[PDB]
mmCIF file of C-alpha atoms in Angstrom:
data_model
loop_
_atom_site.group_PDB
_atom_site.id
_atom_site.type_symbol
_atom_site.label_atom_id
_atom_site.label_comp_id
_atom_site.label_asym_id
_atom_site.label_seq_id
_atom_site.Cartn_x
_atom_site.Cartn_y
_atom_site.Cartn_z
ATOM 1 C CA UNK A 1 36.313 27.597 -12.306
ATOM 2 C CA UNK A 2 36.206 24.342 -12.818
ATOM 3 C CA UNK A 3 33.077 23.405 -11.064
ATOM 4 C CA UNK A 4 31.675 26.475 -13.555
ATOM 5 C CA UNK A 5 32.284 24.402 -16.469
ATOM 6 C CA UNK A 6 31.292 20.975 -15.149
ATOM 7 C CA UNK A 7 28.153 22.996 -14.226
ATOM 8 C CA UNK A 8 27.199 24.044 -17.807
ATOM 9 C CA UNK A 9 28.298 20.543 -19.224
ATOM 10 C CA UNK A 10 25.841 19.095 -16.418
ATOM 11 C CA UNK A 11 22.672 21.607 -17.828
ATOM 12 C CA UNK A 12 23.554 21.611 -21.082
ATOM 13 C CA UNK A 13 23.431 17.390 -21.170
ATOM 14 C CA UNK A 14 20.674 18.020 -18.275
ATOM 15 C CA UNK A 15 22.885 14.998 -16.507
ATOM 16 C CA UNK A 16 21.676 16.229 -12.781
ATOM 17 C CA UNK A 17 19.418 13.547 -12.276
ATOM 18 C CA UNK A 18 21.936 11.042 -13.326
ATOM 19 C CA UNK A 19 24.769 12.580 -11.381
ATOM 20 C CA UNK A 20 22.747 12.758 -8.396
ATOM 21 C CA UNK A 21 21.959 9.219 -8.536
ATOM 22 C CA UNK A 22 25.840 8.266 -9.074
ATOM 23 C CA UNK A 23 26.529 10.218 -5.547
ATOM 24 C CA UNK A 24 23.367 7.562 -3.917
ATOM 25 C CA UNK A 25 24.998 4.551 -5.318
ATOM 26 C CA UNK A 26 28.386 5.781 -4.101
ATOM 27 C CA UNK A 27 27.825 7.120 -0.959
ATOM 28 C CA UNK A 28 28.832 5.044 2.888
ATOM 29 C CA UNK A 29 26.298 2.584 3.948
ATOM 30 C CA UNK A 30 27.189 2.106 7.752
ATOM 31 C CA UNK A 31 25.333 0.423 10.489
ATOM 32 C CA UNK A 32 22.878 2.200 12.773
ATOM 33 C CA UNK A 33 22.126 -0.217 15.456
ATOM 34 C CA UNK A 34 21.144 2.219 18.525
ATOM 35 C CA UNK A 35 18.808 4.712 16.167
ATOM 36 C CA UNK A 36 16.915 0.995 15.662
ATOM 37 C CA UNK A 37 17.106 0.004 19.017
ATOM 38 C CA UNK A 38 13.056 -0.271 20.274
ATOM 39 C CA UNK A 39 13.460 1.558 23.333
ATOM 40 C CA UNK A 40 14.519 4.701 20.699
ATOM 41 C CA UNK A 41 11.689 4.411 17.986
ATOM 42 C CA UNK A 42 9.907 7.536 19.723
ATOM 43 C CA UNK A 43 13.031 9.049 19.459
ATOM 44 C CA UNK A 44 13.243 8.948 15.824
ATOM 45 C CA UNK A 45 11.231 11.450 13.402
ATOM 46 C CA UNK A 46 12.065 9.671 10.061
ATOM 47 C CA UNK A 47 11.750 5.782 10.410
ATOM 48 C CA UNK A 48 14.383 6.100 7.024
ATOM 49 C CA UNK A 49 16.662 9.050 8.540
ATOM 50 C CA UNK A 50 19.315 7.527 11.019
ATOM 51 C CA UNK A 51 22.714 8.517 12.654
ATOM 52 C CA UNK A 52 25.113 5.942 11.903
ATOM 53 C CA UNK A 53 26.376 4.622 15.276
ATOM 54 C CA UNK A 54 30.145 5.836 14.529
ATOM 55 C CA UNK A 55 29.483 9.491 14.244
ATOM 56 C CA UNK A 56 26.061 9.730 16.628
ATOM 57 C CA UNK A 57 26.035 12.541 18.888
ATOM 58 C CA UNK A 58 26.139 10.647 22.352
ATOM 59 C CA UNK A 59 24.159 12.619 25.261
ATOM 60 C CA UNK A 60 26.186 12.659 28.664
ATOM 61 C CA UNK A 61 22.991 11.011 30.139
ATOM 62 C CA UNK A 62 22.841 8.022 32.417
ATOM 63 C CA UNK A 63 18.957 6.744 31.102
ATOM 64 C CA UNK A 64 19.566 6.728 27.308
ATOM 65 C CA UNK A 65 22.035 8.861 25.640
ATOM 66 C CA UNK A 66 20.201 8.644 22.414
ATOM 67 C CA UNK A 67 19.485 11.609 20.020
ATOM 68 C CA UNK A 68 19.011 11.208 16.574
ATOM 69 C CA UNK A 69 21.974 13.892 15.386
ATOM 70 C CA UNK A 70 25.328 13.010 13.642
ATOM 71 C CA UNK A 71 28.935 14.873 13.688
ATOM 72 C CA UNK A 72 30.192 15.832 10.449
ATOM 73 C CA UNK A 73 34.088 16.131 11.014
ATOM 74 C CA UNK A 74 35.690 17.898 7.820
ATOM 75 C CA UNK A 75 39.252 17.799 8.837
ATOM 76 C CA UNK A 76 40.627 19.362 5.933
ATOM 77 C CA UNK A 77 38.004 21.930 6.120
ATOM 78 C CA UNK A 78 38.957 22.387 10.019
ATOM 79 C CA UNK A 79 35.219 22.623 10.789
ATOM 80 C CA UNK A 80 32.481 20.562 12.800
ATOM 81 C CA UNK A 81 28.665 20.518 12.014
ATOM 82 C CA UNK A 82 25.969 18.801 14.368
ATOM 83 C CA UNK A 83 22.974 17.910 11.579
ATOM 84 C CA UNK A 84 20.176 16.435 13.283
ATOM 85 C CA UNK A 85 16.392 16.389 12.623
ATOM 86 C CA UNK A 86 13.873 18.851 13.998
ATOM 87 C CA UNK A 87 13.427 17.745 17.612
ATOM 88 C CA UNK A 88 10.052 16.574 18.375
ATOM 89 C CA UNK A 89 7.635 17.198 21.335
ATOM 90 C CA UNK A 90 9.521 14.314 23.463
ATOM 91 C CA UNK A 91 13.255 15.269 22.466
ATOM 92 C CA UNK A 92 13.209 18.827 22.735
ATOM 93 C CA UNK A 93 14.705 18.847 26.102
ATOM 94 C CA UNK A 94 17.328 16.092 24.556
ATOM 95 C CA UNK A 95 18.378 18.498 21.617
ATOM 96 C CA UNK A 96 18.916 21.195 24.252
ATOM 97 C CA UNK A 97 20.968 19.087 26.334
ATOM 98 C CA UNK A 98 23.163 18.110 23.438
ATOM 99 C CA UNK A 99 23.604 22.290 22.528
ATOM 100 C CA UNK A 100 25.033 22.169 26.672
ATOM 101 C CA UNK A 101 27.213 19.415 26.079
ATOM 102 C CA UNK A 102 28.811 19.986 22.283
ATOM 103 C CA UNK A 103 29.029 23.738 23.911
ATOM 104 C CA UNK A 104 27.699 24.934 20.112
ATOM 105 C CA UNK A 105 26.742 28.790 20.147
ATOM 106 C CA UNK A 106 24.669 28.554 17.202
ATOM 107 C CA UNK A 107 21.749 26.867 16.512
ATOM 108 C CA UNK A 108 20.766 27.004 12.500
ATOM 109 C CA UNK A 109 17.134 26.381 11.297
ATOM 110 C CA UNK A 110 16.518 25.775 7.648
ATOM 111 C CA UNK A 111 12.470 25.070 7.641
ATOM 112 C CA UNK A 112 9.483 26.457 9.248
ATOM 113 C CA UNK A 113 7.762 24.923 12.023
ATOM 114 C CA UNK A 114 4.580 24.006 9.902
ATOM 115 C CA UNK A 115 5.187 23.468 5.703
ATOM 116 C CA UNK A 116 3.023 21.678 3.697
ATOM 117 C CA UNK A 117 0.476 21.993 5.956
ATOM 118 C CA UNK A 118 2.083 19.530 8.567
ATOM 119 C CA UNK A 119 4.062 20.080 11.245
ATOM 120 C CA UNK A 120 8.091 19.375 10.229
ATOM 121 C CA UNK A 121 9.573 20.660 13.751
ATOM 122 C CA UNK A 122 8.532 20.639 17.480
ATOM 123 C CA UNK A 123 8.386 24.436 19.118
ATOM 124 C CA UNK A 124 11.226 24.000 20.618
ATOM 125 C CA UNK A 125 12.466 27.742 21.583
ATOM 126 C CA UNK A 126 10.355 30.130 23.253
ATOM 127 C CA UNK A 127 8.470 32.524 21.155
ATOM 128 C CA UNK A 128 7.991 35.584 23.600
ATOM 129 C CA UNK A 129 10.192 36.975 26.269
ATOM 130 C CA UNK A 130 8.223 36.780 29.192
ATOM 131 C CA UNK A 131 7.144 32.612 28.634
ATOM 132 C CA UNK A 132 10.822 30.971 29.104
ATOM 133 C CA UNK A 133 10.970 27.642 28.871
ATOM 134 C CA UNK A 134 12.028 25.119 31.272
ATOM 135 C CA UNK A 135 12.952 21.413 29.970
ATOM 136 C CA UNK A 136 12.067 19.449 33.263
ATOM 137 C CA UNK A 137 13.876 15.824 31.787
ATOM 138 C CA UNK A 138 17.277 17.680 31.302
ATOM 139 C CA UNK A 139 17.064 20.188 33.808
ATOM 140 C CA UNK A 140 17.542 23.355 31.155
ATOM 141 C CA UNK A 141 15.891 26.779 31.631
ATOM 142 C CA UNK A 142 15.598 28.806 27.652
ATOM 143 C CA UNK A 143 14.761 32.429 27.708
ATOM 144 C CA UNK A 144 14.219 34.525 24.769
ATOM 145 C CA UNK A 145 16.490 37.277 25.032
ATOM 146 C CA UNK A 146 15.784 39.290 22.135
ATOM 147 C CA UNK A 147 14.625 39.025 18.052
ATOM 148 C CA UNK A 148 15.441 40.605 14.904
ATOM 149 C CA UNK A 149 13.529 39.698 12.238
ATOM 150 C CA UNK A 150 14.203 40.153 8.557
ATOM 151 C CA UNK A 151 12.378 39.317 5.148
ATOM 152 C CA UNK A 152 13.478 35.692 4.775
ATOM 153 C CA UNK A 153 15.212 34.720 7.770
ATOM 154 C CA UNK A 154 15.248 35.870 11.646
ATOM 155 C CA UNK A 155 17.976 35.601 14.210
ATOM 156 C CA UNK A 156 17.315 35.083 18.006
ATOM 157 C CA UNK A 157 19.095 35.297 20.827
ATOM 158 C CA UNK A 158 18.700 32.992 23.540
ATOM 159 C CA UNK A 159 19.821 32.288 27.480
ATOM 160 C CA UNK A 160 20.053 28.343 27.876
ATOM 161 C CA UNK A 161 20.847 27.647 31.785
ATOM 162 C CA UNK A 162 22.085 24.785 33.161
ATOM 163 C CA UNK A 163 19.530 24.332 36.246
ATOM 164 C CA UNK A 164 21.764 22.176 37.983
ATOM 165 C CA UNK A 165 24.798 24.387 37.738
ATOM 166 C CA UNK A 166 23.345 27.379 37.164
ATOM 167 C CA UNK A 167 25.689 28.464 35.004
ATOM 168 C CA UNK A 168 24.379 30.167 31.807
ATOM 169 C CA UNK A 169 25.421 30.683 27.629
ATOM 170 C CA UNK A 170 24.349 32.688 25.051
ATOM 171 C CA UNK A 171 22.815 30.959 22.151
ATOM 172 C CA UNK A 172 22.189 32.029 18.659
ATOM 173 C CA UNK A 173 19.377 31.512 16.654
ATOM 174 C CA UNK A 174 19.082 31.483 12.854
ATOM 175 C CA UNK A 175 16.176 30.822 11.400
ATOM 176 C CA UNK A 176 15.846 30.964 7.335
ATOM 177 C CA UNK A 177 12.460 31.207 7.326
ATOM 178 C CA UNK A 178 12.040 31.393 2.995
ATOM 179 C CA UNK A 179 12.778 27.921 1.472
ATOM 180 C CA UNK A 180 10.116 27.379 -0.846
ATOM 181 C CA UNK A 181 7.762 24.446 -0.380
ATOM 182 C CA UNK A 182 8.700 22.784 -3.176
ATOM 183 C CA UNK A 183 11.547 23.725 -5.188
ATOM 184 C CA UNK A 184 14.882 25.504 -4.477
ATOM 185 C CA UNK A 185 15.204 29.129 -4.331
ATOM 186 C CA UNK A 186 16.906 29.245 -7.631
ATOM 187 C CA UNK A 187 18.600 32.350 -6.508
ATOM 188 C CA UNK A 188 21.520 31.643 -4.218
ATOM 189 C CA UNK A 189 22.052 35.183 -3.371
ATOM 190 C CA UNK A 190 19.568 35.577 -0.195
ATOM 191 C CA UNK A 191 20.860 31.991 0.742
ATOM 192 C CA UNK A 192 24.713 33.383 1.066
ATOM 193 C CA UNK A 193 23.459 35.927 2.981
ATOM 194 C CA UNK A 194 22.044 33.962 5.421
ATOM 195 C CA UNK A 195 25.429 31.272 5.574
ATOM 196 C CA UNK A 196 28.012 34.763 5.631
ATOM 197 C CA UNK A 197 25.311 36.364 8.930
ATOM 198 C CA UNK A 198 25.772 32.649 10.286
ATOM 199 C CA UNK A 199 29.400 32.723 10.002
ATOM 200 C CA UNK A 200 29.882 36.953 10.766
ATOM 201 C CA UNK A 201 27.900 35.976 14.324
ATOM 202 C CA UNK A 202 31.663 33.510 15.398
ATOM 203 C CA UNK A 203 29.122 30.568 16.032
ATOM 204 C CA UNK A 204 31.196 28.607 13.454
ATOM 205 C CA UNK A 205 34.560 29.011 14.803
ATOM 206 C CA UNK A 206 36.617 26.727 16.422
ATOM 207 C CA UNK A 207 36.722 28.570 19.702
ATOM 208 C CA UNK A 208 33.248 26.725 20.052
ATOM 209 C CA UNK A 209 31.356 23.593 19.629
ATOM 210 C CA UNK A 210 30.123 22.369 16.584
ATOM 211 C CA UNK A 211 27.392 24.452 15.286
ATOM 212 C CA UNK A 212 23.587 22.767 15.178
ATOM 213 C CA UNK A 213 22.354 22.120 11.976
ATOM 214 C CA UNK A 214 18.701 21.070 11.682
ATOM 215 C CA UNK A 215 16.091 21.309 8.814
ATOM 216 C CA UNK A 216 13.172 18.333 9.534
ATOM 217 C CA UNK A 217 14.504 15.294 8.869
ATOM 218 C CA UNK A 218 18.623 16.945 8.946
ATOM 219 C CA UNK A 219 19.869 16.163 5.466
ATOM 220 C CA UNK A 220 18.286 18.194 2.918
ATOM 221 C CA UNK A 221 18.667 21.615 3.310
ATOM 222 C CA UNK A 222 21.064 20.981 6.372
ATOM 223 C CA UNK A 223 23.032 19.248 3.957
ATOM 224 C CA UNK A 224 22.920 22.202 1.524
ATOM 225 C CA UNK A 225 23.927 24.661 4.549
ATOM 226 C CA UNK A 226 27.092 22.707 5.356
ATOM 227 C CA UNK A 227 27.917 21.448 2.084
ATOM 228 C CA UNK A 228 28.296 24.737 0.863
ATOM 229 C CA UNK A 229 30.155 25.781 3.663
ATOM 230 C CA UNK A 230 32.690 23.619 3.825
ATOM 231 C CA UNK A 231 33.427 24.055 -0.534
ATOM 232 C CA UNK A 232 34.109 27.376 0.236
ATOM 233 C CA UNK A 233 35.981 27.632 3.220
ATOM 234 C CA UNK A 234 38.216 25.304 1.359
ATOM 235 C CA UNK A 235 38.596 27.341 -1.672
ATOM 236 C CA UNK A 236 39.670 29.884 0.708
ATOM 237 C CA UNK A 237 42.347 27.810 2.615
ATOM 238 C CA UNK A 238 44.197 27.616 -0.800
ATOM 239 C CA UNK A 239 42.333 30.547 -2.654
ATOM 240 C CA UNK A 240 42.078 27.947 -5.648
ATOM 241 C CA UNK A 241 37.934 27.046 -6.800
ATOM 242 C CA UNK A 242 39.675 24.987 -9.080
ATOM 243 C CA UNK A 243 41.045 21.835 -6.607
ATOM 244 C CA UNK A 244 38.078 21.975 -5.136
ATOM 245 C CA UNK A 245 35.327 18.940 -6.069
ATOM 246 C CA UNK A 246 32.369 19.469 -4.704
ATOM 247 C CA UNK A 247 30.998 15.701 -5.263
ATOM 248 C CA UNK A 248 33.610 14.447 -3.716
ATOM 249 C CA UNK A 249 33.047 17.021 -0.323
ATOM 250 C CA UNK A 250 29.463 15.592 -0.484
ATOM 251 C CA UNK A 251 30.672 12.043 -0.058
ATOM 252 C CA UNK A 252 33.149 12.639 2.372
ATOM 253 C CA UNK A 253 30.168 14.731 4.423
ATOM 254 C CA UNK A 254 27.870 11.725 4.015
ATOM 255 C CA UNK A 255 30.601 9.301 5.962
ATOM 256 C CA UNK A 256 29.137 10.949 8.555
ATOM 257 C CA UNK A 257 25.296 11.061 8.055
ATOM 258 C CA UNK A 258 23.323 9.671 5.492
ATOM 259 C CA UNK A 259 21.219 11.313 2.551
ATOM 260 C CA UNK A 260 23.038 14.128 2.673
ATOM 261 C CA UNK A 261 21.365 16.263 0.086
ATOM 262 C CA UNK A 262 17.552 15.100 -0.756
ATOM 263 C CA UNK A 263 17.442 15.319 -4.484
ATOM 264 C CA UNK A 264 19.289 16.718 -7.797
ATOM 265 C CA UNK A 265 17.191 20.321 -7.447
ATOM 266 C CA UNK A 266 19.484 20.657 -3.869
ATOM 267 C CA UNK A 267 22.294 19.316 -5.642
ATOM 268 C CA UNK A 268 21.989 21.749 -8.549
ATOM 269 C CA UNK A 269 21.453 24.444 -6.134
ATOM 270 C CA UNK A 270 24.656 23.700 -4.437
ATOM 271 C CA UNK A 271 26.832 23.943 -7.024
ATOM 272 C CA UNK A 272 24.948 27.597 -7.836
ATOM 273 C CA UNK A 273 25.767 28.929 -4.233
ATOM 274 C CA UNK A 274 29.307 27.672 -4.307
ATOM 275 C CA UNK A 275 30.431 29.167 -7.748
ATOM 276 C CA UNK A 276 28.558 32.162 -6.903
ATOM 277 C CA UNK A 277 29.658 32.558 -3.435
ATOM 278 C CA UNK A 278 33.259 31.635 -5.028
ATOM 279 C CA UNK A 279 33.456 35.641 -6.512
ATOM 280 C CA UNK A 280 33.738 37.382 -2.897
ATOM 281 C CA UNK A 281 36.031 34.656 -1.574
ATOM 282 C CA UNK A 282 38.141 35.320 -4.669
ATOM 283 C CA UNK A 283 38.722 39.078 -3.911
ATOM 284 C CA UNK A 284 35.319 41.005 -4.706
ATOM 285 C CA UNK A 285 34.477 41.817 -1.313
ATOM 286 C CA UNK A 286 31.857 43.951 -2.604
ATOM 287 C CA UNK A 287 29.983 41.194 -3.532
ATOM 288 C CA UNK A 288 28.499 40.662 -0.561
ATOM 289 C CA UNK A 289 26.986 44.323 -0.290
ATOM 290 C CA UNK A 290 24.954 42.872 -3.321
ATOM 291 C CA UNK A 291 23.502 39.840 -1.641
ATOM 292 C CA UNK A 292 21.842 42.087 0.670
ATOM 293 C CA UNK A 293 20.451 44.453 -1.968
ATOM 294 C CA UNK A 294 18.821 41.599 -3.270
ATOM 295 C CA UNK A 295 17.436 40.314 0.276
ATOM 296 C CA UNK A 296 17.608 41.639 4.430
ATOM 297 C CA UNK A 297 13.606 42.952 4.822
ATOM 298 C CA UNK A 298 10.441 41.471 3.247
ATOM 299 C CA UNK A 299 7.515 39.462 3.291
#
């Protein structure tokens, strides 16, 4: 692989720094007029993390269809993400209303409610079964359906009803519960796992909407979740690792939303999920059996 040997010439010169900095300088600046708007300020987590007003998620609302959340479109990839930040106490019911909308059946969570001590997300899906939640702004009723937890991530399955309609979907829930607080895991392997359950579960298929993305501000490790995604779903579409540049995906993904990818540690990390994830693309289905040796059960 190509990306294999620009890897090693990247340690070996220890260039990551450097080539991270390259993909700032490079990377779309594009306006974000309604994310500054006044009337939106409470709407925002990150007074530095926008959408970009050409690839916002628009809510089908009358009063404000703000919501700080971007589409990523990767055409040649075939395949939409929603990143956004972790909704807050005020936009919870927005962020639901957007999952009714985009019609997305999976919801993907990349950080814990509280790190560092501080709170990074609003508790924004109910936690027990018997206290469902009802979103009073948006008119949404969300019901815990059922749990299954696992050593560094959890899925959930959830009941979102339209109040108004009453009609009713089946959301997914997938919560990586293990990034570290202030590195990378430096093994990709439990990582894979956790994108191959996402994509196993159909929530990234093009039967549905775009699948949510959120981490706390929506670019770090959401960027790391999609970026990754989209690298090898195109090395698939031509089985060839070799054609495909993974600067140049990242890039192209941060058209759409800005800061894609927080720092060269997330950028180095990338690359390691990619090439690794490249061997059971490439034919060694078996590979994947070996992810979840190395993962599935504890804390």
């Amino acid at each position: 692989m190509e990306m294999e040997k620009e890897f090693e010439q990247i340690d070996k010169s220890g260039s990551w720094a450097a080539i991270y900095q390259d993909i700032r300088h490079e990377a779309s600046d594009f306006p974000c007029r309604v994310a500054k708007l006044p009337k939106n300020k409470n709407r925002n987590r990150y007074r530095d993390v926008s959408p970009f007003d050409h690839s916002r998620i628009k809510l089908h609302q009358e009063d404000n269809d703000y919501i700080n959340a971007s589409l990523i479109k990767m055409e040649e990839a075939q395949r939409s993400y929603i990143l956004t930040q972790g909704p807050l106490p005020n936009t919870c019911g927005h962020f639901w209303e957007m999952v009714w909308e985009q019609k997305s059946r999976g919801v993907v969570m990349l950080n814990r409610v509280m790190e560092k001590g501080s709170l990074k997300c609003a508790q924004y899906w109910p936690q027990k079964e018997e206290k469902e939640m009802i979103f009073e702004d948006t008119n949404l009723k969300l019901t815990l359906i059922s749990e299954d937890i696992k050593s560094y991530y959890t899925v959930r399955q959830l009941e979102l009803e339209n109040l108004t309609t009453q009609e009713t979907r089946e959301i997914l829930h997938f919560h990586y519960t293990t990034w570290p607080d202030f590195g990378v895991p430096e093994s990709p392997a439990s990582f894979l796992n956790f994108l191959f359950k996402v994509r196993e579960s159909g929530s990234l298929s093009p039967e549905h909407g775009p699948v949510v993305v959120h981490c706390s501000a929506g670019i770090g490790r959401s960027g790391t979740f999609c970026l990754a995604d989209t690298c090898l779903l195109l090395m698939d579409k031509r089985k060839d690792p070799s054609s495909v540049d993974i600067k140049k995906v990242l890039l192209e993904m941060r058209k759409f939303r800005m800061g894609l990818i927080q720092k060269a540690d997330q950028l180095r990390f990338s690359y390691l999920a990619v090439i690794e994830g490249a061997k059971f693309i490439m034919g060694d289905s078996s590979v994947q059996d070996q992810w979840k040796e190395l993962s599935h059960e504890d804390l």
